[PDB]
């Protein structure tokens, strides 16, 4: 099981301890998705930043490449070269 955590809010008005926690967690920019294997340690860290973050549990995690592939929009065309 994995927490899919997302940095919903910015770190602009945020004090330095909370910023440091966010950095440790692995979230860079706003809206940058990170999957974390569930445990007590990561849960407590997430609780510490509960108002900046959106968490949701998952069966499986996704690698960055997989996430990118999921994101990619449908090109509404099929090329045929001649």
């Amino acid at each position: 099981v994995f927490y899919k955590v997302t940095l919903s809010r910015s770190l602009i008005g945020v004090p330095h301890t909370t910023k440091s926690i966010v950095k440790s967690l692995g979230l860079g920019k706003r809206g940058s998705i990170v999957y974390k294997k569930v445990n007590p340690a990561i849960a407590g860290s997430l609780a510490k930043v509960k108002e900046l973050v959106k968490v949701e549990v998952t069966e499986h995690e996704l690698t960055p490449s997989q996430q990118r592939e999921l994101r990619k929009s449908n090109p509404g065309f099929i090329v045929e070269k001649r």
Partner: protein, 119 residues
């Protein structure tokens, strides 16, 4: 006070709705955290994900902060909370010993659910 910080003493309807939504989101986050921990513990014992999700007896979190957050006396949910504590902080130097939450700096990030028993 020649510089004009034109901040109204009370919130609009739309502001209040947003605040409520934010409060609900933090409760949801907490719920997710507890749920994931429970699922993990079920897996450790030796159940599948689906089986863990089904389980009648949900495991309560052992770490302290999480356990406190779970308690409504310490950290109440938005549905539990009073109208007043959603939209008014305690401020000892204000008249009424109360102040709009919107007047708190970084109120959109910072959480503040519980006021004192009689203030």
């Amino acid at each position: 006070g020649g510089l004009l910080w034109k901040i109204p003493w009370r919130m609009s309807t739309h502001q209040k709705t947003r605040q409520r939504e934010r409060l609900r989101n933090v409760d949801q986050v907490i719920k997710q955290l507890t749920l994931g921990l429970h699922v993990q513990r079920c897996q450790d014992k030796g159940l599948t994900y689906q089986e863990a999700m089904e389980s009648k007896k949900k495991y309560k979190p052992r770490s302290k902060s999480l356990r406190l957050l779970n308690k409504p006396s310490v950290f109440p949910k938005e549905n539990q909370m009073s109208s007043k504590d959603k939209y008014w902080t305690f401020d000892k130097k204000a008249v009424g010993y109360r102040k709009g939450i919107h007047k708190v700096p970084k109120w959109t990030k910072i959480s503040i659910r519980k006021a004192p028993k009689f203030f």
